[PDB]
Scaffold this active site. Sequence first.
Site, mmCIF file in Angstrom:
data_model
loop_
_atom_site.group_PDB
_atom_site.id
_atom_site.type_symbol
_atom_site.label_atom_id
_atom_site.label_comp_id
_atom_site.label_asym_id
_atom_site.label_seq_id
_atom_site.Cartn_x
_atom_site.Cartn_y
_atom_site.Cartn_z
ATOM 1 N N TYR A 177 -6.916 74.402 38.851
ATOM 2 C CA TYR A 177 -8.140 74.010 38.145
ATOM 3 C C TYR A 177 -8.128 72.500 37.835
ATOM 4 O O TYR A 177 -9.104 71.780 38.118
ATOM 5 C CB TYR A 177 -8.305 74.834 36.847
ATOM 6 C CG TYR A 177 -9.491 74.301 36.086
ATOM 7 C CD1 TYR A 177 -9.318 73.459 34.980
ATOM 8 C CD2 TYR A 177 -10.784 74.551 36.530
ATOM 9 C CE1 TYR A 177 -10.416 72.915 34.329
ATOM 10 C CE2 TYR A 177 -11.902 74.006 35.862
ATOM 11 C CZ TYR A 177 -11.696 73.209 34.773
ATOM 12 O OH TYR A 177 -12.771 72.643 34.116
ATOM 13 N N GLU B 168 -18.288 76.895 29.371
ATOM 14 C CA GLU B 168 -17.809 76.038 28.286
ATOM 15 C C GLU B 168 -18.170 76.605 26.900
ATOM 16 O O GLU B 168 -17.393 76.528 25.939
ATOM 17 C CB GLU B 168 -18.382 74.619 28.441
ATOM 18 C CG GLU B 168 -17.816 73.856 29.617
ATOM 19 C CD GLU B 168 -16.380 73.346 29.450
ATOM 20 O OE1 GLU B 168 -15.697 73.645 28.445
ATOM 21 O OE2 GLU B 168 -15.946 72.578 30.342
ATOM 22 N N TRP C 60 -9.135 77.184 27.019
ATOM 23 C CA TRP C 60 -9.738 77.255 28.338
ATOM 24 C C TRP C 60 -9.072 78.340 29.194
ATOM 25 O O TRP C 60 -9.749 79.001 29.956
ATOM 26 C CB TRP C 60 -9.704 75.900 29.061
ATOM 27 C CG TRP C 60 -10.314 75.967 30.421
ATOM 28 C CD1 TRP C 60 -9.686 75.772 31.605
ATOM 29 C CD2 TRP C 60 -11.684 76.241 30.725
ATOM 30 N NE1 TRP C 60 -10.568 75.909 32.636
ATOM 31 C CE2 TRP C 60 -11.810 76.191 32.126
ATOM 32 C CE3 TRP C 60 -12.832 76.496 29.940
ATOM 33 C CZ2 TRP C 60 -13.019 76.432 32.779
ATOM 34 C CZ3 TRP C 60 -14.038 76.720 30.572
ATOM 35 C CH2 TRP C 60 -14.122 76.683 31.986
#
Length: 182
Positions: free
Chosen positions: A15, A37, A45
């Site tokens: 990522y 988000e 995350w």
Amino acid sequence: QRCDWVSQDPLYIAYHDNEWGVPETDSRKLFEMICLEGQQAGLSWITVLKKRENYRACFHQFDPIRIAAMQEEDVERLLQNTGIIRHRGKIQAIISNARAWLAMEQNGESFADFVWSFVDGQPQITQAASLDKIPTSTPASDALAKALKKRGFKFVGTTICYSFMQACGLVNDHITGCFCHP
Ligand SMILES: [Zn+2]
């Protein structure tokens, strides 16, 4: 060297290496990321990243047309899906965000043009050598949050918007030591 916030998890390394800070100009892809988000609010995350395929599966690959048509019954079924974040406000935010995006796009307004306008159309590259010198919100993310809220988006506070700006390359916040820094 990589940014210090990356873990040893290969999903997260990929990522960081391949997606974060890479300019994204596709409206639908930007839509997916403002949603992901917002799902991360109050969380990390990695929790959202590990669930991204599950999100793509129960939100119709982030097609705003199909998402916008979702109703209370859909919200209730999603609240039973352990592969996403079972939080009513977060699930409803994706649906509100799809509707908000549609109302822009149907009025001839590109969501990509809109978000990119907040950084003057050009990725802003950091000079920070350390994460401590990188902000978590800015005047630009404040302006983007105010605009998204007025236009009907949900779970788009200023910190969420700055993370989105980072993730989608509206700012490039790799530290100067990171191999991904220009
Ligand atoms: Zn980096």
